[PDB]
Amino acid sequence: VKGAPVFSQVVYQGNDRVYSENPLSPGEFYNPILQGCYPDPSITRKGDDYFLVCSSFAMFPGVPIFHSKDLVNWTQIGHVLDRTSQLKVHDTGISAGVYAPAIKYNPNNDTFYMITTQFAGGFGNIIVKSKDPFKGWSDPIKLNFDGIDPSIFFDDNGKAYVVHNDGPRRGEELYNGHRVIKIWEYDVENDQVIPGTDQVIVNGGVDLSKKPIWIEAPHIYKKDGRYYLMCAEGGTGGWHSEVIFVSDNPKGPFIPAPSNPDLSQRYLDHNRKNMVDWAGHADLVEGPDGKYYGVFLAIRPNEKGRVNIGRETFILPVDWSGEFPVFENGLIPMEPKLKTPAGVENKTGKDGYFPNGNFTFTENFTSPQLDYRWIGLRGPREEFISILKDGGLQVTPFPVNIKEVKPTSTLFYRQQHNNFSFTTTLNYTPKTEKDLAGITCVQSENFNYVFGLMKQDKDFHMVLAKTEKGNTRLLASAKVDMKNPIRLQVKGVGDNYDFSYSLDGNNFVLLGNTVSGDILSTNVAGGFTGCLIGLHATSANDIRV
Amino acid sequence: GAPVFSQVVYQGNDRVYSENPLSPGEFYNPILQGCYPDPSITRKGDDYFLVCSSFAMFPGVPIFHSKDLVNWTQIGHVLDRTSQLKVHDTGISAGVYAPAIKYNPNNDTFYMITTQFAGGFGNIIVKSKDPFKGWSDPIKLNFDGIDPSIFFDDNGKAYVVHNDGPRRGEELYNGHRVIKIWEYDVENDQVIPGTDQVIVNGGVDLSKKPIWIEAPHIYKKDGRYYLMCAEGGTGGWHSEVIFVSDNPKGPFIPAPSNPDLSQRYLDHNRKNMVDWAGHADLVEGPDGKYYGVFLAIRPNEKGRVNIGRETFILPVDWSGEFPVFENGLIPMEPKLKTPAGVENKTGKDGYFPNGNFTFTENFTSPQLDYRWIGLRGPREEFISILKDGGLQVTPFPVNIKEVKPTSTLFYRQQHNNFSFTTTLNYTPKTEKDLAGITCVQSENFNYVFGLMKQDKDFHMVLAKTEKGNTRLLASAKVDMKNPIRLQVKGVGDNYDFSYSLDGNNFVLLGNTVSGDILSTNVAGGFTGCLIGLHATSANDIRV
């Protein structure tokens, strides 16, 4: 469009207290390894090469994927589901779309598999394939089973199995949250589960008499000739944990380990410092030092006990010298720092490696190949961005309001710290009341703040509006003299969010008062994701001053 | 070549009415079958007016009139215009929440106060001198929470009571809620700053962690002020409780006997089960006797609700300090005695039906029955009534999965045992065109049963949408020689979709499917199954 808004730069600054208080020594790295909304981690290995994937729901693209040689220094190589033929979330609810993924390398045929559930596009349970994740992946192959959290296991004899969560057979459900682990034989030439090979291997969980919730996230491992089934149990919230079973046969019977769970923060004191909660949904791999490691998700709530940055990806070393794997210190409070594997230096945030700790990301929009952390919601960023020849992000304003279950012209960045600032310079002259551009903080189309520049009657106004249950209310408004680009900032200090603007570039004026991050939490908004910070443009603005 | 639905027949066949035939001077409970939640009632003279919540249905707040509490005439919807109701993009569980209707004798004016989570409205009130004609645009009120209600004292002084959350950081437990009262400025139609006061904290007994104290109503009897509230949430723990005070703003004291309306303690294996009873509102009947309307559900054999929360009524004894719902703590009976001297005329002379009725729609009037609604947008946007009868539906380029108005004429499921049959005259041009029947909890939980064209041939398709993911269950090639009849039949949780090319023999497409995704228990939310005459030009089903 002519006169479309131009965001000339962005600065995202993280300022979390835990990192300032626990500076790294050489040979240490911070946990979580993926800060912000990177849930349901799954990991696999080919030779020296590790690949890590996470769920993504309605975000576009889907299933972010990271590569590492050492489990500390990760390079985001893209997204597994990065084409509209693989990811059909145009109209998808904020809590539907792409659920937990599992990634597995099959050494028998030298093929990588990513198996997941996509509640969109008619996909359901799907698998995509690649010989080389750096080349991308196939279109999805639909798989003939229901439920969530599929995982694929390749036995030494080349035989293949898919385990997944499912419900109990119709009418046998004993309580709310009563779930089942089901296994199939998988035909590797057909890419399909084999009819008549399904079998329930876990009913309920470790101890059915305690009514375990949502036994899920199954993975099968083979070690010392035996078969291990590791699962999440308790649901991905306050009761999250990881449990383990063992069998002599891929299809059971599986017996729970006497010590269970093997990973959890759910029993720990609710007032601890540097709190890590909801820990579970793990996946094991052999590390570069011969040691095992497990990735898993957890949250780091703020001072009001809520999560605003979603479920994040953690890692812990694993001792598997005996019958059952032990998450090292996986049942006591998580520490901020871990020792790097033997002989690896921490290079996070350098040389294209994903950052960690308290970093400052300065985005000047000087290349068409935008950082992979810039995403869309429901639709691809390439539909509304242009990188100007001399730098700067021009956003085509879609006639789509932030409240619509439709792709908006908003370039989003996951909130990755409980204390952060996100500042942008906006060059923009709105022409009528329907035009707005600025910053948005989004849990969903129904739960968000919009902080932006609009024009009404003769004047330009900065507006701050709050959407709750899909109902937008204007919180505060200010007439501004738009004589030059305006800078806009959102600053979060735990649950305290401040929206401020600067016409002189130095002094940021608070618009209204500090507002609560409550609608930016999973606890209030519901769902499966974190706060997304967005460079928003619309030609369907409904705010009036 | 738009699809023409030439006829619809809706038939209810619930066993409870067959087993309990009416005698003279009897009528069936609920008085509004199907999704008519959060009832509120008021009176002017001999004229009763009854309203219900409606969420994202269009139009909003259906409103009924009666002279006798038995024979009701739907007179329209309070939130009738797109200037009053802005649910175009609204989630299935947002939109219009509980309404309260109150006639003010002091200024001869009707008020309807509600919460609309859409269009920037929030808590709103509309006014009318004559509900038969219509109401004002919404007046926005400066408070948060839900379930507002307006009370007019003897001296004309006015109060708004509503549900709210506890003070920021005061929250004791999940579900901890508060009843708050304001003085209301009747000249400016606004709550008066600084007059807000919490009058109930939590519920009858805060030490029992009561959840979602809500639906507050204030009544004045014998000089004392009564606050009647729902407690326990609108699900399995629903109930109604009562408090008393000497003053409008408290302190309010709970009655020793509480709750006074509930089915939550009753045996889970009872027959003709009524559950989730609460959210009541009292009125003086033509009897001189009091009555209370309230919502409840009637689950099927799987223990699920597919027809939503319905409107019930009970006689109320208020000869002593506190109102008593007559038999409101024992299992609900299918039949009640009419107030003294009123005969049952339900389903006749334009009165709303009840029992097991047969609704035959021939689309031979431009004045379409008020039970035909849209979801998110008005029906007038996509319907034309043909000259010699028939409903022509303009197919919108909108899929059933979108949070947008679709071209679908919807009818609430009103029975656990029912059939809905239509005659479809339609020749689809491409894969993108489909017309037929849909059963909808929401855009994310529905069945679509429709006629499609793919390659050179016509197909009937049955597709299931769960969590916004559509899967094709079954397909049949059909010779489209003449119009086709489509039926969905529900027998509790058993739903059968069948088509007839000869008009007599209906062939099942696929197997019977579960109504689980048509229940509130599975799909979540606040509403019932909607049965729709659907057309689209953005069909995504492929054979």
Short mmCIF file of N, CA, C and O in Angstrom, two decimals, chain A residues 311-374:
data_model
loop_
_atom_site.label_atom_id
_atom_site.label_comp_id
_atom_site.label_asym_id
_atom_site.label_seq_id
_atom_site.Cartn_x
_atom_site.Cartn_y
_atom_site.Cartn_z
N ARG A 311 5.18 -22.28 27.90
CA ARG A 311 6.01 -23.41 28.31
C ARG A 311 7.31 -23.39 27.51
O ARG A 311 7.29 -23.22 26.28
N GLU A 312 8.43 -23.55 28.21
CA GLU A 312 9.77 -23.39 27.65
C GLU A 312 10.50 -24.72 27.64
O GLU A 312 10.08 -25.68 28.30
N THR A 313 11.61 -24.80 26.89
CA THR A 313 12.33 -26.05 26.73
C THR A 313 13.54 -26.08 27.66
O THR A 313 14.44 -25.23 27.54
N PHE A 314 13.55 -27.06 28.55
CA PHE A 314 14.62 -27.30 29.50
C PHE A 314 15.37 -28.57 29.10
O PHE A 314 14.89 -29.37 28.30
N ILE A 315 16.55 -28.74 29.68
CA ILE A 315 17.31 -29.97 29.51
C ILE A 315 17.95 -30.34 30.84
O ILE A 315 18.28 -29.48 31.66
N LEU A 316 18.10 -31.65 31.07
CA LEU A 316 18.83 -32.16 32.23
C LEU A 316 19.66 -33.37 31.83
O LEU A 316 19.23 -34.17 30.98
N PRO A 317 20.82 -33.56 32.45
CA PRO A 317 21.56 -34.82 32.25
C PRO A 317 20.80 -35.98 32.87
O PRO A 317 20.03 -35.82 33.82
N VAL A 318 21.00 -37.16 32.30
CA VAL A 318 20.29 -38.36 32.72
C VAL A 318 21.30 -39.47 32.97
O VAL A 318 22.18 -39.71 32.14
N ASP A 319 21.20 -40.11 34.14
CA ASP A 319 21.99 -41.28 34.48
C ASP A 319 21.19 -42.51 34.08
O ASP A 319 20.09 -42.73 34.61
N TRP A 320 21.71 -43.32 33.16
CA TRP A 320 21.06 -44.58 32.81
C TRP A 320 22.04 -45.74 32.92
O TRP A 320 22.12 -46.62 32.06
N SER A 321 22.80 -45.76 34.02
CA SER A 321 23.70 -46.87 34.32
C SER A 321 22.98 -48.09 34.89
O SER A 321 23.57 -49.17 34.93
N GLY A 322 21.74 -47.94 35.35
CA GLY A 322 21.00 -49.04 35.92
C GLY A 322 19.77 -49.37 35.12
O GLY A 322 19.69 -49.04 33.93
N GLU A 323 18.78 -49.99 35.75
CA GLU A 323 17.59 -50.41 35.03
C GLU A 323 16.83 -49.21 34.46
O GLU A 323 16.38 -49.25 33.31
N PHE A 324 16.69 -48.14 35.24
CA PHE A 324 15.80 -47.05 34.87
C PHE A 324 16.56 -45.73 34.79
O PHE A 324 17.51 -45.51 35.55
N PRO A 325 16.15 -44.83 33.89
CA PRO A 325 16.85 -43.55 33.79
C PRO A 325 16.50 -42.64 34.97
O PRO A 325 15.37 -42.61 35.45
N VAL A 326 17.51 -41.92 35.44
CA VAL A 326 17.36 -40.96 36.52
C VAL A 326 17.65 -39.57 35.96
O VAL A 326 18.76 -39.31 35.49
N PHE A 327 16.66 -38.68 36.02
CA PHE A 327 16.94 -37.28 35.70
C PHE A 327 17.77 -36.69 36.82
O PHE A 327 17.30 -36.60 37.96
N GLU A 328 19.01 -36.29 36.52
CA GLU A 328 19.91 -35.83 37.58
C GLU A 328 19.35 -34.58 38.23
O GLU A 328 19.20 -33.54 37.58
N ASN A 329 18.98 -34.69 39.52
CA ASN A 329 18.36 -33.61 40.28
C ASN A 329 17.01 -33.19 39.67
O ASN A 329 16.55 -32.05 39.86
N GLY A 330 16.33 -34.11 38.98
CA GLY A 330 15.04 -33.86 38.39
C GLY A 330 13.86 -33.84 39.33
O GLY A 330 12.73 -33.60 38.89
N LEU A 331 14.08 -34.09 40.63
CA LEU A 331 13.01 -34.07 41.63
C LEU A 331 13.26 -33.05 42.73
O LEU A 331 12.54 -33.05 43.74
N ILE A 332 14.28 -32.21 42.58
CA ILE A 332 14.56 -31.13 43.52
C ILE A 332 14.47 -29.83 42.71
O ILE A 332 14.37 -29.90 41.48
N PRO A 333 14.45 -28.65 43.33
CA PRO A 333 14.26 -27.41 42.55
C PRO A 333 15.31 -27.26 41.46
O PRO A 333 16.51 -27.42 41.70
N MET A 334 14.84 -26.94 40.25
CA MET A 334 15.75 -26.70 39.13
C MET A 334 16.69 -25.55 39.41
O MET A 334 16.26 -24.50 39.89
N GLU A 335 17.95 -25.73 39.04
CA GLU A 335 18.94 -24.68 39.14
C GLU A 335 18.97 -23.84 37.86
O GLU A 335 18.65 -24.33 36.78
N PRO A 336 19.39 -22.57 37.96
CA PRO A 336 19.50 -21.74 36.74
C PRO A 336 20.60 -22.19 35.79
O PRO A 336 20.48 -21.97 34.58
N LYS A 337 21.67 -22.78 36.31
CA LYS A 337 22.85 -23.10 35.51
C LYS A 337 23.12 -24.59 35.55
O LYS A 337 22.89 -25.26 36.56
N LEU A 338 23.63 -25.10 34.44
CA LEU A 338 24.13 -26.45 34.32
C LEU A 338 25.56 -26.39 33.82
O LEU A 338 25.96 -25.42 33.18
N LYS A 339 26.32 -27.45 34.10
CA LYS A 339 27.62 -27.61 33.46
C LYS A 339 27.43 -28.04 32.01
O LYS A 339 26.59 -28.89 31.70
N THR A 340 28.21 -27.44 31.11
CA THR A 340 28.18 -27.89 29.73
C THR A 340 28.72 -29.31 29.64
O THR A 340 29.49 -29.74 30.49
N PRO A 341 28.31 -30.07 28.61
CA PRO A 341 28.93 -31.39 28.40
C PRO A 341 30.44 -31.25 28.31
O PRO A 341 30.95 -30.16 28.03
N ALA A 342 31.15 -32.34 28.59
CA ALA A 342 32.60 -32.30 28.69
C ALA A 342 33.23 -31.62 27.49
O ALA A 342 33.13 -32.11 26.36
N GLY A 343 33.83 -30.46 27.72
CA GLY A 343 34.63 -29.81 26.72
C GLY A 343 33.89 -28.92 25.74
O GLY A 343 34.45 -28.62 24.67
N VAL A 344 32.67 -28.48 26.04
CA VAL A 344 31.97 -27.57 25.14
C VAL A 344 31.90 -26.19 25.78
O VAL A 344 31.63 -26.05 26.98
N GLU A 345 32.21 -25.19 24.98
CA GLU A 345 32.18 -23.80 25.39
C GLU A 345 30.79 -23.24 25.10
O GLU A 345 30.13 -23.64 24.14
N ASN A 346 30.34 -22.33 25.96
CA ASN A 346 29.04 -21.68 25.78
C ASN A 346 29.21 -20.55 24.77
O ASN A 346 29.92 -19.57 25.03
N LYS A 347 28.58 -20.69 23.60
CA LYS A 347 28.61 -19.66 22.56
C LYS A 347 27.21 -19.11 22.27
O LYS A 347 26.98 -18.59 21.17
N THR A 348 26.28 -19.21 23.22
CA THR A 348 24.91 -18.79 22.97
C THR A 348 24.87 -17.32 22.56
O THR A 348 25.60 -16.49 23.10
N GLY A 349 24.02 -17.01 21.59
CA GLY A 349 23.89 -15.65 21.11
C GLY A 349 25.00 -15.17 20.19
O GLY A 349 24.94 -14.04 19.72
N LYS A 350 26.01 -15.99 19.92
CA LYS A 350 27.08 -15.61 19.01
C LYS A 350 27.03 -16.48 17.76
O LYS A 350 26.52 -17.60 17.79
N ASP A 351 27.55 -15.95 16.65
CA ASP A 351 27.78 -16.74 15.44
C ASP A 351 26.50 -17.38 14.91
O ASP A 351 26.53 -18.50 14.39
N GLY A 352 25.37 -16.69 15.03
CA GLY A 352 24.13 -17.28 14.59
C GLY A 352 23.50 -18.27 15.55
O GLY A 352 22.43 -18.83 15.22
N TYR A 353 24.11 -18.52 16.71
CA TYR A 353 23.51 -19.40 17.71
C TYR A 353 22.37 -18.69 18.43
O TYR A 353 22.43 -17.48 18.69
N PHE A 354 21.33 -19.45 18.76
CA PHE A 354 20.19 -18.92 19.50
C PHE A 354 20.66 -18.30 20.81
O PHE A 354 21.57 -18.84 21.46
N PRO A 355 20.10 -17.17 21.23
CA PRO A 355 20.58 -16.51 22.45
C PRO A 355 20.08 -17.20 23.71
O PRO A 355 19.23 -18.09 23.68
N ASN A 356 20.60 -16.75 24.85
CA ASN A 356 20.05 -17.12 26.15
C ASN A 356 20.40 -16.02 27.14
O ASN A 356 20.97 -14.98 26.78
N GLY A 357 20.06 -16.24 28.41
CA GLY A 357 20.28 -15.22 29.43
C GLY A 357 19.55 -13.93 29.10
O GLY A 357 18.45 -13.93 28.52
N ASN A 358 20.17 -12.81 29.47
CA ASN A 358 19.60 -11.48 29.25
C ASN A 358 20.26 -10.89 28.01
O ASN A 358 21.36 -10.35 28.08
N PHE A 359 19.59 -10.99 26.87
CA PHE A 359 20.17 -10.51 25.63
C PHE A 359 19.40 -9.31 25.12
O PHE A 359 18.29 -9.02 25.57
N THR A 360 20.02 -8.60 24.17
CA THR A 360 19.42 -7.46 23.48
C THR A 360 19.42 -7.80 22.00
O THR A 360 20.49 -7.97 21.40
N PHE A 361 18.24 -7.92 21.41
CA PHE A 361 18.08 -8.20 19.99
C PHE A 361 17.72 -6.89 19.32
O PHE A 361 16.67 -6.32 19.61
N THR A 362 18.59 -6.40 18.45
CA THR A 362 18.33 -5.18 17.70
C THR A 362 18.00 -5.57 16.27
O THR A 362 18.83 -6.17 15.58
N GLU A 363 16.79 -5.24 15.83
CA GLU A 363 16.31 -5.57 14.50
C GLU A 363 16.20 -4.27 13.70
O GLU A 363 15.34 -3.43 13.99
N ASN A 364 17.07 -4.10 12.71
CA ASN A 364 17.04 -2.93 11.84
C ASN A 364 16.42 -3.22 10.48
O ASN A 364 16.32 -2.30 9.66
N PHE A 365 16.01 -4.46 10.22
CA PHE A 365 15.33 -4.82 8.98
C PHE A 365 16.17 -4.44 7.76
O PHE A 365 15.76 -3.64 6.91
N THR A 366 17.37 -5.01 7.70
CA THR A 366 18.35 -4.70 6.67
C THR A 366 18.59 -5.86 5.71
O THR A 366 19.47 -5.76 4.85
N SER A 367 17.83 -6.94 5.82
CA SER A 367 17.92 -8.05 4.89
C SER A 367 16.54 -8.63 4.66
O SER A 367 15.71 -8.63 5.58
N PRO A 368 16.26 -9.11 3.45
CA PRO A 368 14.98 -9.80 3.22
C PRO A 368 14.85 -11.11 3.98
O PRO A 368 13.72 -11.54 4.25
N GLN A 369 15.96 -11.75 4.36
CA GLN A 369 15.91 -12.99 5.14
C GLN A 369 15.81 -12.64 6.63
O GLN A 369 16.79 -12.59 7.37
N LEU A 370 14.57 -12.40 7.06
CA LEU A 370 14.29 -12.02 8.43
C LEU A 370 14.56 -13.17 9.39
O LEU A 370 14.29 -14.33 9.07
N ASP A 371 15.08 -12.83 10.57
CA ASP A 371 15.26 -13.77 11.67
C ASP A 371 14.06 -14.70 11.83
O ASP A 371 12.91 -14.26 11.79
N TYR A 372 14.34 -16.00 12.04
CA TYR A 372 13.28 -17.00 12.19
C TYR A 372 12.36 -16.74 13.38
O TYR A 372 11.27 -17.32 13.46
N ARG A 373 12.79 -15.92 14.34
CA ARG A 373 11.94 -15.64 15.50
C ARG A 373 10.76 -14.74 15.16
O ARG A 373 9.79 -14.68 15.93
N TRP A 374 10.82 -14.03 14.03
CA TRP A 374 9.69 -13.22 13.59
C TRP A 374 8.69 -14.13 12.89
O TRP A 374 9.00 -14.72 11.84
#
